[PDB]
């Protein structure tokens, strides 16, 4: 569909599905493609983005719909899923569902994601992106953002035994980066924690993209 876009379509090194962050558009990930030229990148956008009505009721329901798309695009596994912040949380729930239905998910990439249901700026994020929150783009994005943040707050991530890479930016006061983001290592026995530099909101902007892509490449090459 119009919400699934595939980058590096002739790549033969494997595939990676990336779920949109809380703003709802997978466009930040497009700049990864030249930096991950051996990876088929399937980037997923929110199909309910423009719809004040007909939002997904739960993060689980969103994930279930995205799984469908993934299976249609890559009918055979093993699967590698991930996303930046909110998208990483959705990717986890996708991995949880796929593995419960017999699929192999060899990698799950949480790019500086947090678990708001455990450890809980809408307009200010756009201002920081250079968009007018009150422009036509602006209002839709803030609306999308607050809903996805509500989906995340109501969702608790389940125990998941597969391999999970959590890429973490610097943690205020250098405290434990896993608890600071609301995750419980008892639920993620095969968690691997990897550093990525810069600020949570800046990870895909022009300056940062090469370092963020480096951290993703390293996470996938276990």
Automatic annotation (TrEMBL):
Residue numbers of the full-length protein present here: 1695 to 1923 of 1925
Protein name: NocB
Organism listed in the record: Nocardia uniformis subsp. tsuyamanensis
Domain of life: Bacteria
Gene that this polypeptide is encoded by: nocB
């Amino acid at each position: 569909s119009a919400y699934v876009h595939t980058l590096n379509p002739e790549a033969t090194g494997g595939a990676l599905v990336l779920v949109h962050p809380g703003e709802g558009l997978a466009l930040p990930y497009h700049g990864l493609a030249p930096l991950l030229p051996d990876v088929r990148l399937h980037v997923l956008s929110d199909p309910r983005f423009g719809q004040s009505d007909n939002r997904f009721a739960t993060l689980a329901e969103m994930a279930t719909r995205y799984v469908e798309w993934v299976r249609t695009t890559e009918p055979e596994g093993p699967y590698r899923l991930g996303g930046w912040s909110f998208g990483g949380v959705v990717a986890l729930e996708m991995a949880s569902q796929m593995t419960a239905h017999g699929d192999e998910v060899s990698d799950l990439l949480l790019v500086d994601s947090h678990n708001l249901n455990a450890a809980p700026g809408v307009r200010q994020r756009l201002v920081e992106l250079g968009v007018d929150p009150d422009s036509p783009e602006g209002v839709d994005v803030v609306e999308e953002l607050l809903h996805n943040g509500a989906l995340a707050a109501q969702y608790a991530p389940p125990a998941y035994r597969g391999r999970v890479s959590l890429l973490v930016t610097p943690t205020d006061g250098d405290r434990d980066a896993v608890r600071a983001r609301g995750w419980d290592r008892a639920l993620l026995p095969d968690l691997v924690v990897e550093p990525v530099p810069g600020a949570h909101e800046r990870l895909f902007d022009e300056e940062h993209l090469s370092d963020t892509a480096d951290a993703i490449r390293r996470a996938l090459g276990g």
